[PDB]
């Protein structure tokens, strides 16, 4: 509220002292006026820096405001208020403080007065407007010149509106749809549309997203699992790929820039020169759509890692503002690597805890999101890395070297996070978790977790969830249905059964391996006290292989990621079903096609919440490629011509599978199924086969209103005669038979069955099911409904 | 000379009769004068006169005029013979014959001559005497002085005379339709039967007319032979009674009981009944054949020439007893009747005056009614040696008969009868000459000849009848027995036995091992072994005698109680199975398991090399409640039941219609020459790889079309199901076609009023994945028939 003694500019009056809340630029309510707030404790000097967009393309500054050290700063929080400020203006902060290469008493400490940062809370960002736009070829590295190099050019921050309304919701609310009820579709924004065929205006946008909507509520799907929409840098290691024509991009988007704004690329407005606040409405657009469609939106999130790597990759952000307290650090800076990208974010210091979850509550409040997915979230569970408050001398006025650089060590020297725990070690109550799971505004907020790290950590089972708030990534689910279902020795009949219960050999499991570390100790509390639908089912997803690619190919073809490469997952459980790649061999072609529909059977007649990746609906193929990063195109895009082709029904038999599984409660549950809720069957009634050997699983379920569904794969190289079960009065009629050609290897009426040609196809097998014998065919898949008995059946149709 | 008046003096009816002329026998128009000869044989009468009656008087059982033959006139040799001019139309007639009688003199056994009697001509061409099925005689004194006739059953009975000059039946080109014998498909029906019932709905139900209106349902359902059950009159009320604890009465349904050979019956006559002249069944069964032929379906006689309906000696005086005894019937010395056709009579078949008359029935057939083929019941009768006895001997002065040596019987020196030529009577011929003129006749060389080889002593002639080139076809009983077993899944050779009948029974027909014990085999039938092919086997499941194809899948035993005699009449060995339970049930698995059963059978018979023959009502699963023999029921038990065909409740007469019409269109199944190991392979749940243990539950295999086509065929009669390994021709596929596993109408997958072409191509498709890995799997107790079609990958992506 009083005056800082910063002179007034064409752009604004006279700087006022401003106050530490909240962080991030907002407007003060009693002067109209930009409060900037910004943390820093290792910080000596702060200035605010304005750019017009002009002065911003240009590598210049517009205006620099020095904070007065002593009056525009409350402990560690710097803040200053500038009153009638331009609101077109956009800010970041020049940062001078000490930097350990310069003087190597103060290891972790790396301001670089050279630099403008960015403010982790900025509300949008602008730097480059389109998607795969190099920034301006400008002298960096010389006097006065801002931005780092072209393909990471000045960034900044807009400004709260200060005039205008705000985005009209019309009573949206996040859906809040029982996690059970779950079918999630993993999509990328740009991928979703960036294809010629996809016939949009604007391919590859949220606003291109929202035009292809419909597809995904007649697909049946319910919620959609987005690829990092946070801000990033898709040219972050641009370069030709070696051996190829192609250029490097960053496509997923797994290395974020900045965590509170949304992707401007992934802006149609943005990309047509619209203010940096557009894409915030573009966005809040896209999730209204969503959500008047009965789509839940769920963000990928990634809070293990930044885009500013390990100490030779850019300083865009944290590194600038407070590197010690944003980053894992051991006592001489180095950078912690559990994420395998260069660095750790710092995830449960105070500060650090406090950013996430104002930056989970942001997503919530203001684009309406209603769930997380936490990219490798065992980091999330880790110590942090503690250092001293920086000394300084009274009498010099002068920083002063501490011991160990101001480290928090033990007595070997191992760094600490000042609370006696080494940092790094897995905590069984994480505060961050414990803050997410337990905050007020997250509670109807659906949170899954990826729970592993690139450090060989593994908390599958045994996330620390706080009483059911946390689903789980199952990659034991993948690994077993993909052994299962291309036919394979050993215990997957058994684990199969299991994965088709919701896995609570994994989940409700309380008899760890002797072996498992984090099972025996931190993780057992955590053990148990959560149902099948902790369970996030999945066959394949973005890296790794596709659904039509796992049958096709028995290794990995990344050759399109550069000669020289080592990328990609070495074991795939896959099965090419006889030939490498596309064949004209007519019997690997048949198999091929009920081995997709076989997968997909399993993924969608499991408890617990399938997840189906973009493309695998319709039969996407990335030519063998298991780890498609890099690519800016089709090998990422959803085809919408090959998806309007359809060549053999494999779109129908999933889109029906979708809605069936919707339809049926006793697949949707919160509680495990027991012994009266589902029987396992083998060639006869209740004799399963458990072996070494097994190539067959086959059950029953009840409704509980006495009708039921008998499900059953075979997984061997032989045909089969099953005996059913015979239940008292009743009978077993056809629906599901991946062994017959479309349409009939899904019997419902649609388009294309009517109410006829279902009843007589049913009417054909009278005889058949009437005896309690069905034939199926090696690699094939069985679904048949408990109906009523009636003879009459077996007479003319 | 013929025109010279013989004595006899004219009436108001005709004019002064004349000598007259032998030949030909029976009545014929002489051409020139107009005026009717009448030619009869009789070489034991004494005395034979013309009697001559109008409707009214035969009747009131009395003649109308009376004209004696003189015996040095009117007779050359054993024919006697009379010429009447200016006959008048109105009138019938017949021949009362007066000689000895074996009751009043022993010293002639074998002489039946009843003076009290007016017989029938054996060449009559129309007979009258009641006009309505089923309509009693009248009442007269029978038995009294001056009336004629037996008793109210048997009512004097007269011959028409022949058609006037310048009045034939329009034929309009019909000619026999010579079809080939192996691309027949015959239906056997029974002419009262087939539209009896009212669902009929025809204007003259029971008549030949009758059957005429519903030929079209015939023509539809694929059939090109109709084999109509005795069609030569007979009487209905021969036996005529009160069944033992019924409001029915006891008919000769089926007619197996001859009185004239020459005479169509007149109580299938639509026209008879309305009062027409006798002749008009005649007209009236040569449109019948005109319809048929005119549809492409030949018209096959069943002809019983080995008994006659006069019975045993206790049996009425109608015609052959009273005219030549000892000529016409097989007697021992004693004048005892042999009784190989176990009904009381055998006929004297290959003596030489009845070996005559035999070949003129044929040919009368042939010629006048154009007749295609003749199925001969009881045919090992034919071969047998016949009973002679020496002319008889007068005293010259005298006059008198004179008694011989054994009553002039020739026999042997141990008393035994005798055929005259040192055969003994009954002995079966290795080349009965009868056979011999039948197989030879230049008239009949385009007639189809079809022998039931055996007869009710034991004989039995299966395999080698004497056939004379291949000039006549079998009832091949082996196969129906074979077919029954294997189908209803049964221990033993059946499995093997049962390729054999699919195969035409090349084990019969073609082989000559003959069966240790079989004498005839051995000795008589052993120049007949070979020299034929398939075509020479008549296949069927099922007859008008025995079960119905219905009852036969649900019924252990027969149930003949409705027959009177307490269950003891029928065959006793049936080779049935109910399929779990005896009769009518709620049980649905037994229901299911008939509804295939009845069409494993039905395959077996239609996919079998050889002429398949169906019986009326097997196409539609008609009962007769388990009665295995409804000789005696003038009801619905024997009447094709057009309201139960209508409704076809599990689509079976529909199943049956495509697989006739799917045989017919398929050339390797319809041969003159057995298959080969290039024809047919055999196979079972592997290829190649058949199962002919006695515990065997399939038969499958391939047939080739020469093409580079094919079917695949195979019964499981197990009651467990099966994956079966198909074949596998290069660049070719298996589509399915028939599967009795499925529910109709998708049992048989043929385009028609229910299934469209595209319904036929989705529904092949359908199963593509199964056919393209050559697997298909098989319902116990089930059938299926595949073809072979060049491969096409596109078919396992989306149907349209």
């Known amino acids: 509220?009083?005056?800082?003694?910063?002179?007034?500019?064409?752009?604004?009056?006279?700087?006022?002292?401003?106050?530490?809340?909240?962080?991030?630029?907002?407007?003060?309510?009693?002067?109209?006026?930009?409060?900037?707030?910004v943390f820093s404790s290792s910080a000596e000097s702060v200035s605010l820096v304005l750019f017009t967009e002009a002065d911003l393309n240009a590598?210049?500054?517009?205006?620099?405001?020095?904070?007065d050290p002593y009056v525009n700063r409350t402990g560690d929080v710097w803040h200053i208020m500038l009153p009638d400020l331009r609101d077109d203006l956009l800010y970041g902060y020049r940062v001078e403080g000490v930097h350990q290469?310069?003087?190597?008493?103060?290891p972790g400490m790396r301001h670089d007065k050279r630099r403008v940062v960015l403010d982790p809370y900025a509300v949008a960002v602008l730097n480059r407007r389109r998607w795969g736009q190099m920034g301006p070829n400008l002298p960096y590295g010389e006097e006065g010149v801002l931005g780092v190099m072209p393909t990471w050019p000045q960034a900044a921050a807009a400004l709260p509106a200060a005039r205008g309304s705000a985005f009209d919701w019309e009573g949206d609310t996040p859906l809040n749809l029982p996690m059970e009820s779950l079918v999630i579709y993993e999509a990328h924004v740009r991928g979703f549309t960036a294809h010629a065929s996809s016939g949009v205006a604007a391919p590859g946008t949220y606003a291109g997203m929202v035009e292809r909507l419909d597809y995904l509520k007649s697909l049946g799907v319910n919620a959609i699992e987005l690829l990092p929409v946070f801000e990033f840098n898709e040219l972050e290691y641009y370069s030709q790929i070696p051996g190829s024509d192609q250029?490097?991009?960053?496509?997923?988007?797994?290395?974020?820039?900045?965590?509170?704004?949304?992707?401007?690329?992934?802006?149609?407005?943005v990309g047509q020169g619209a203010p940096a606040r557009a894409s915030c409405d573009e966005f809040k657009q896209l999730v209204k759509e969503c959500h008047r469609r009965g789509i839940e939106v769920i963000l990928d999130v990634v809070f293990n890692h930044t885009a500013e790597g390990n100490e030779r990759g850019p300083t865009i952000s944290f590194r600038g503002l407070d590197n010690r307290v944003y980053y894992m650090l051991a006592p001489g800076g180095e950078y912690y690597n559990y994420s395998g990208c260069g660095n750790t974010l710092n995830c449960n210091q105070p500060v650090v805890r406090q950013f996430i979850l104002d930056c989970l509550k942001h997503w919530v409040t203001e684009y309406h999101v209603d769930g997380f997915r936490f990219d490798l979230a065992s980091i999330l569970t880790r110590a942090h890395?503690?250092?001293?408050?920086?000394?300084?001398?009274?009498?010099?006025?002068?920083?002063?070297?501490?011991?160990?650089?101001?480290?928090?060590?033990?007595?070997?020297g191992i760094m600490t996070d000042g609370a006696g725990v080494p940092t790094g070690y897995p905590l069984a109550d994480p505060p961050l978790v414990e803050s997410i799971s337990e905050d007020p505004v997250?509670?109807?907020?659906?949170?899954?977790?990826?729970?592993?790290?690139?450090?060989?950590?593994?908390?599958?089972?045994?996330?620390?969830?706080?009483?059911?708030?946390?689903?789980?990534?199952?990659?034991?689910?993948?690994?077993?249905?993909?052994?299962?279902?291309?036919?394979?020795?050993?215990?997957?009949?058994?684990?199969?059964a299991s994965a088709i219960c919701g896995s609570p050999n994994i989940y409700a499991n309380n008899t760890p391996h002797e072996t498992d570390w984090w099972a025996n100790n931190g993780g057992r509390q955590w053990k148990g006290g959560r149902g099948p639908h902790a369970s996030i089912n999945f066959v394949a997803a973005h890296d790794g292989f596709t659904l039509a690619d796992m049958v096709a190919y028995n290794n990995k073809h990344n050759e399109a990621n550069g000669e020289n490469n080592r990328d990609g997952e070495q074991h795939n459980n896959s099965w090419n079903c006889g030939e490498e790649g596309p064949t004209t061999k007519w019997e690997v072609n048949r198999l091929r096609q009920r081995q997709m529909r076989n997968l997909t059977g399993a993924l969608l007649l499991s408890c617990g919440?399938?997840?189906?990746?973009?493309?695998?609906?319709?039969?996407?193929?990335?030519?063998?490629?298991?780890?498609?990063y890099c690519h800016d195109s089709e090998l990422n895009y959803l085809r919408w011509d090959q998806l309007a082709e359809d060549p053999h029904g494999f779109n129908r038999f999933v889109r029906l599978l979708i809605h069936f599984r919707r339809a049926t409660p006793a697949l949707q549950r919160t509680t495990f199924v027991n012994d009266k809720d589902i029987q396992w069957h083998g060639e006869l009634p209740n004799t399963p086969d458990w072996t070494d050997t097994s190539r067959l699983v086959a059950f029953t379920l009840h409704d509980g209103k006495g009708g039921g569904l008998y499900v059953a794969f075979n997984t061997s190289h032989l045909p089969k005669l099953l005996q059913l079960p015979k239940w008292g009065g009743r009978v077993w009629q056809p629906l599901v038979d991946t062994s017959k050609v479309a349409p009939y290897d899904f019997l419902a009426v649609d388009g294309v069955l009517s109410a006829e040609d279902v009843a007589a196809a049913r009417r054909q097998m009278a005889m058949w099911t009437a005896?309690?014998?069905?034939?199926?065919?090696?690699w094939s898949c069985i679904v048949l409904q408990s109906a009523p008995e009636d003879p009459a059946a077996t007479s003319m149709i």
Not at 60 to 65: C, L, N, W, Y
Not at 101 to 106: A, L, P, V
Not at 249 to 268: D, E, L
Request: one cysteine or more; aromatic letters at 14%.
């Open 771 to 778: 005896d309690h014998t069905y034939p199926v065919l090696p």
């Open 609 to 628: 919440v399938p997840m189906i990746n973009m493309g695998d609906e319709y039969g996407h193929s990335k030519n063998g490629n298991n780890n498609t």
């Open 385 to 412: 890395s503690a250092w001293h408050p920086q000394q300084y001398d009274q009498e010099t006025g002068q920083r002063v070297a501490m011991s160990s650089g101001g480290a928090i060590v033990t007595a070997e």
């Open 247 to 269: 250029y490097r991009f960053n496509f997923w988007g797994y290395s974020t820039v900045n965590y509170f704004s949304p992707m401007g690329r992934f802006s149609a407005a």
């Open 101 to 106: 290469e310069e003087d190597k008493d103060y």
């Open 1 to 37: 509220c009083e005056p800082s003694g910063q002179p007034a500019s064409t752009a604004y009056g006279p700087a006022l002292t401003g106050r530490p809340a909240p962080l991030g630029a907002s407007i003060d309510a009693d002067t109209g006026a930009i409060n900037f707030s």
């Open 442 to 496: 997250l509670r109807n907020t659906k949170m899954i977790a990826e729970a592993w790290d690139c450090d060989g950590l593994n908390q599958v089972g045994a996330f620390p969830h706080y009483g059911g708030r946390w689903s789980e990534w199952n990659g034991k689910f993948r690994d077993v249905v993909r052994n299962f279902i291309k036919g394979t020795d050993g215990p997957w009949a058994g684990d199969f």
């Open 59 to 67: 590598g210049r500054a517009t205006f620099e405001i020095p904070l």
